[PDB]
Design a protein around this ligand. Structure first.
Ligand code: K
Ligand code: K
Ligand code: K
Ligand code: K
Ligand code: K
Ligand code: MG
Ligand code: MG
Ligand code: MG
Ligand code: MG
Ligand code: MG
Ligand code: MG
Ligand code: MG
Ligand code: MG
Ligand code: MG
Ligand code: MG
Ligand code: MG
Ligand code: MG
Ligand code: MG
Ligand code: MG
Ligand code: MG
Ligand code: MG
Ligand code: MG
Ligand code: MG
Ligand code: MG
Ligand code: MG
Ligand code: MG
Ligand code: MG
Ligand code: MG
Ligand code: MG
Ligand code: MG
Ligand code: MG
Ligand code: MG
Ligand code: MG
Ligand code: MG
Ligand code: MG
Ligand code: MG
Ligand code: MG
Ligand code: MG
Ligand code: MG
Ligand code: MG
Ligand code: MG
Ligand code: MG
Ligand code: MG
Ligand code: MG
Ligand code: MG
Ligand code: MG
Lengths: 51, 206, 203, 251, 120
RNA sequence: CGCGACCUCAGAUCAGACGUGGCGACCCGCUGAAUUUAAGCAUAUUAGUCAGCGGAGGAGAAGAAACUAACCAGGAUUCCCUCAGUAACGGCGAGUGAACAGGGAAGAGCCCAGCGCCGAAUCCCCGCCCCGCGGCGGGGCGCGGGACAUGUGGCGUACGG
RNA sequence: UAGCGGCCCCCGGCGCGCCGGGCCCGGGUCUUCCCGGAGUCGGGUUGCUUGGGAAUGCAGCCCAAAGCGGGUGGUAAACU
RNA sequence: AAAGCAUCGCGAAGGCCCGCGGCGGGUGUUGACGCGAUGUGAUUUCUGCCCAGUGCUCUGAAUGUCAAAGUGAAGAAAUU
């Protein structure tokens, strides 16, 4: 589920990623924290790819 | 069936209550048994106080009882730290310790810190070895003064400060108590919607 | 140390590494008997945090329990009552399958004391638990003051009286507004106190 | 109501089969190396009556391939076999009455009996007296064979399924009118407790859906749904049609 | 491979942990001999292998392990499945060898998940 | 081929131990009705009660906050008085129904895993001798055995260390 | 029967009295380091339960965590 | 009841039935000349018309209805 969420975040479907993670992890507050840290690893991957 | 004027009553007697009825015929026997245990414990622990270790002053919570104080479970770690008593040592010398309690205000902390210090002066400490005393109370102090202190140790009493009569000033006569309460309630009730509106106009103007 | 990593790895149960290990283990456990003594704890980290020690007198038993609810065992689904009590399916047991697993291990080994149990795998029909058992008469157990408590007779069949971690979870114990049902020690204790008519001598 | 007669039968009890004097399980020889790659010879030592069964059974003795020991096998007797006759079982056995061959090696139109439903099940199809199966076609690519069963159904089976060449002995048994209730009594006394049969309309409502009435009558359609619960599923279960079957059988 | 592992065990044999009986000999001898002269001689504890996954894991994290050898047949494999990656991250060389029982024989035990060199 | 190590298993009338069954007033874990009330009756009530099953002890269970509160705050559990037939639940019908504060009885606090450091510093069994000595053991010894690095023990646990 | 009545025998805790023995540092200040229990919490849904009422507790199934996090704050939800 | 007659289901991953449960058990040491379910009631001679109703059964290209899960859209989210 963390992989599909990252796929949605990569197409910039942030709303869809949040609605997906909420169904999987449960609460809205747990969903934001998860989505946020998955954004960081995607951002981390972009930096590594650039370098 | 109701008859004429009466109260509508709903007695809670629809279960097998007769099977669970606690009678109190052993109440005199229970009181005797508790008394003998108290006396037996006091003889065993003499000359230590019969009631038990000293308890702190605490203020009862809620608006119904915050005007009264009572005995707490035990002295907080901050109170013992200020008084200079190690938390492990406090139990042996008859001081109750409650690590859960936290001191929100300094008035309560100083009240119990003073209580601990005044207790420490009143304490007579027998040496572990009667022949050899190190830092214990004086032989004379132990020989005569030591006796079992009955009743709570340093009972916690509600102290009321007397306020002498005085001339009423002009300001006090002009103070509107009713309007101060009525406006204070409205200020608290409308504080948020006022912060919203005042903020809302801020970006409206800017 | 190593245990912290094993603890973190076991939290990643849908990772590729752990998905493989759980599946291959669950297949293996499905090929054994319902009650089977394990040579050693499958999860050394989880075992020792639950009370296990690598010393003689501690044993592990793997228990397999069927998953699902509790069908009402009435003949032909007839309950002979009012419609409120006509339910036969969609009924749930009051205790957990982990509690049932401890009860099975405890009943089989009546000479041992159930300490705790932990999950090790599941499939559609079975859940696998590893119960830590202690032999209360081994000298390594009786001569250790930290474990001398389990040797006392009051701790006989803790799993059958709801005193293990898994067992006590179903009792409704706890502190606070939520756990008012069991003020006094148990739901039965609270009910007795609240339904007992206190008739004093002077009324 | 109470539990109806059809529902009591499943509990076993008085409805269990009478197997005291039955001679054994009439089955083919267990498949092994010899009957996979060549053939094995056996001799018919006796042809015996099995109580409750209209078909005779044949005691056939084969040598054991791996141990010095004789193996006795109880076969369904193909009509025409006689005591002292050698019968051969295997892939390389010849097409003779009483021989056992895989249906793959049989030519199309072969008449067989005691045919395996699955490869190695030792014979399940066309075992009653006077019944047989016909080999229709083969599919050498898929290793499959089409057969026609006594009911008229056509079934696709593996070509490794073995069968006995010929028809089951004892045919024509149903031609004789039983005539007497006593002959029917003796017939089922060797089978199971299923006779005589009381009509449901002659019972009371408590014990059959058709019971009751001031006249004897079903009162409800006899045709009943396939999903009807046990205790209700009586009469014509899932009938596609009812009435004198006029013309030919369809599908 | 076979010849490297044989070479690895040849060096690791020189740093096998003292048996309890061997340690007792060392002690009585050290206690009695140092009693005659000056007892206070801590000197240097000689280098020795470090065994156990917990002991090795801390050594890797502190970068105190010069070489880590892990058995390939640890079960459950969770006990060491992180170890090759951890050694790579801290930049300490690690080798997987055949047989936890082979490692256990070094430390006079039945098995051993891993051993580590710190000093030689 | 074989010889070894480990792992996972198995057998024994193997050496030494342990469980079973009873009683069941009170206690713990399950399961669990209907009579009855509702002037009928199905939710409700009876009732988480009777019956059924399992497990204990002289008590049991509970228990040192993932607590209560919203105050100038209290401070493990259990029991009593009160809260209170109340807040609340309810064909909002019949009926049902706690808690917190307050006053008392009693009062007691703690230990691991983890995280680290200490040369496994730890434990069980066996043999011998010396002493208290109905087996309770203390120590000494043994190039005795085993457990144990898939982690024993000392220190340390949210009050910090 | 009464009696801080007598005598005899047995049993147990305490009180001081060599030993068989073991065991033996603590507190404060400062700097630095360390710090936590997962198919669990939580979410959905089902059934039971509760005074707990847009769900008090329990269990099944499915989903399935985090670490300035997590739980609670008696009306569902977002923000603070 | 009965022989006789007729109808119905089923080729075993099956029909019919049992069972709280184990894909446990009966038929079944069985296999359509068999098992299971009904009606009628030996033989003789016949068994007409009705498929509108109610059953049962077949069919599912496709329209009309049709739950949970899922998918979409709006919303801060619940939710719609
Ligand atoms: K009828
Ligand atoms: K749930
Ligand atoms: K069957
Ligand atoms: K019609
Ligand atoms: K019709
Ligand atoms: Mg008191
Ligand atoms: Mg062992
Ligand atoms: Mg009933
Ligand atoms: Mg229950
Ligand atoms: Mg207890
Ligand atoms: Mg307890
Ligand atoms: Mg409670
Ligand atoms: Mg009451
Ligand atoms: Mg009936
Ligand atoms: Mg009969
Ligand atoms: Mg008939
Ligand atoms: Mg009849
Ligand atoms: Mg009649
Ligand atoms: Mg009927
Ligand atoms: Mg008639
Ligand atoms: Mg009729
Ligand atoms: Mg009519
Ligand atoms: Mg023996
Ligand atoms: Mg018993
Ligand atoms: Mg009595
Ligand atoms: Mg009534
Ligand atoms: Mg009446
Ligand atoms: Mg009535
Ligand atoms: Mg109830
Ligand atoms: Mg009862
Ligand atoms: Mg007893
Ligand atoms: Mg008690
Ligand atoms: Mg705590
Ligand atoms: Mg309280
Ligand atoms: Mg009142
Ligand atoms: Mg409710
Ligand atoms: Mg009630
Ligand atoms: Mg209170
Ligand atoms: Mg440790
Ligand atoms: Mg007298
Ligand atoms: Mg918080
Ligand atoms: Mg809030
Ligand atoms: Mg006729
Ligand atoms: Mg008819
Ligand atoms: Mg007609
Ligand atoms: Mg016409």
């Amino acid at each position: 589920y963390e992989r599909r969420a990252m796929e949605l975040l990569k197409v910039s479907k942030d709303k869809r990623a949040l609605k997906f993670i909420k169904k999987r992890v449960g609460t809205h507050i747990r969903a934001k924290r998860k989505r946020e840290e998955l954004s960081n690893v995607l951002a981390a991957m972009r930096k590594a790819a650039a370098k | 069936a109701p008859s004429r004027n009466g109260m509508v009553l709903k007695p809670h007697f629809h279960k097998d209550w007769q099977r669970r009825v606690a009678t109190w015929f052993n109440q005199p026997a229970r009181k005797i048994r508790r008394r003998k245990a108290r006396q037996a414990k006091a003889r065993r622990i003499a000359p230590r106080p019969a009631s038990g270790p000293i308890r702190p002053i605490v203020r009862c919570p809620t608006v119904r009882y915050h005007t009264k104080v009572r005995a707490g479970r035990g002295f907080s770690l901050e109170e013992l730290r200020v008084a200079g008593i190690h938390k492990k040592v406090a139990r042996t010398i008859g001081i109750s310790v409650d690590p859960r309690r936290r001191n929100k205000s300094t008035e309560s902390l100083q009240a119990n810190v003073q209580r601990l210090k005044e207790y420490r002066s009143k304490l007579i400490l027998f040496p572990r070895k009667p022949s050899a005393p190190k830092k214990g109370d004086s032989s004379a102090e132990e020989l005569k003064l030591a006796t079992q202190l009955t009743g709570p140790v340093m009972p916690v009493r509600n102290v009321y400060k007397k306020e002498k009569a005085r001339v009423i000033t002009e300001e006090e006569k002009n103070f509107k108590a009713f309007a101060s309460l009525r406006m204070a309630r409205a200020n608290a009730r409308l504080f948020g919607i006022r912060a919203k509106r005042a903020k809302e106009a801020a970006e409206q103007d800017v | 140390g190593a245990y912290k990593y094993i603890q973190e790895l076991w939290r990643k149960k849908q990772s590729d590494v752990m998905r493989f290990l759980l599946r291959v283990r669950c297949w293996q456990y499905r090929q054994l008997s319902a009650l089977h003594r394990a040579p050693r704890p499958t999860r050394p980290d989880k075992a020792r945090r639950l009370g296990y020690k690598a010393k003689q007198g501690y044993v592990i038993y793997r228990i397999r329990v069927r998953r699902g609810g509790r069908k009402r065992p009435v003949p032909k689904g007839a309950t002979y009552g009012k419609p409120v009590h006509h339910g036969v399916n969609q009924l749930k047991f009051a205790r957990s399958l982990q509690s049932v697993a401890e009860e099975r291990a405890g009943r089989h080994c009546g000479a041992l004391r159930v300490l705790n149990s932990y999950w090790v795998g599941e499939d559609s029909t079975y859940k696998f638990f590893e119960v830590i058992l202690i032999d209360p008469f081994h000298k390594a157990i009786r001569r250790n003051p930290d474990t001398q408590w389990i040797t006392k007779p009051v701790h006989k069949h803790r799993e059958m009286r709801g005193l293990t971690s898994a067992g006590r979870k179903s009792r409704g114990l706890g502190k606070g507004h939520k756990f008012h049902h069991t003020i006094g020690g148990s739901r039965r204790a609270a009910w007795r106190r609240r339904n007992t008519l206190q008739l004093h001598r002077y009324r | 109501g109470r539990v109806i007669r059809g529902q009591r039968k499943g509990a076993g009890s008085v409805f269990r089969a009478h197997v005291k004097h039955r001679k054994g399980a009439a089955r083919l020889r267990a498949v092994d190396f010899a009957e996979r790659h060549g053939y094995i010879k056996g001799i018919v030592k006796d042809i015996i009556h099995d109580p409750g069964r209209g078909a005779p059974l044949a005691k056939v003795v084969f040598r054991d391939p791996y141990r010095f020991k004789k193996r006795t096998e109880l076969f369904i007797a193909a009509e025409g076999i006689h005591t002292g006759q050698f019968v051969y079982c295997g892939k390389k056995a010849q097409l003779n009455i009483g021989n056992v061959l895989p249906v793959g090696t049989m030519p199309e139109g072969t008449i067989v009996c005691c045919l395996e439903e699955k490869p190695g099940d030792r014979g399940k199809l066309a075992r009653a007296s006077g019944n047989y199966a016909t080999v229709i076609s083969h599919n050498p690519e898929t290793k499959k064979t089409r057969v026609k069963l006594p009911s008229g159904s056509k079934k696709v089976i593996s070509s490794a399924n073995r069968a006995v060449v010929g028809v089951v002995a004892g045919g024509g048994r149903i031609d004789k009118p039983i005539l007497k209730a006593g002959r029917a009594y003796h017939k089922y006394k060797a089978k199971r407790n299923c006779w005589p049969r009381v009509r449901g309309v002659a019972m009371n409502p408590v014990e059959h859906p058709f019971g009751g009435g001031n006249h004897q009558h079903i009162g409800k359609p006899s045709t009943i749904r396939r999903d009807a619960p046990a205790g209700r599923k009586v009469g014509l279960i899932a009938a596609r049609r009812t009435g004198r079957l006029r013309g030919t059988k369809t599908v | 491979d076979r010849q490297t592992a044989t070479q690895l065990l040849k060096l690791a044999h020189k740093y096998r942990p003292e048996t309890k009986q061997e340690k007792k000999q060392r002690l009585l001898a050290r206690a009695e001999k140092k009693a005659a002269g000056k007892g206070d001689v801590p000197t240097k504890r000689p280098p020795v292998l470090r065994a156990g996954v917990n002991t090795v894991t801390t050594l890797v994290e502190n970068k105190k392990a010069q070489l880590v050898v892990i058995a390939h047949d640890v079960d459950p494999i969770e006990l060491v499945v992180f170890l090759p990656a951890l050694c790579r991250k801290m930049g300490v060389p690690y080798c997987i060898i055949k047989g936890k029982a082979r490692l256990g024989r070094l430390v006079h035990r039945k098995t051993c998940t891993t051993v580590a060199f710190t000093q030689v």
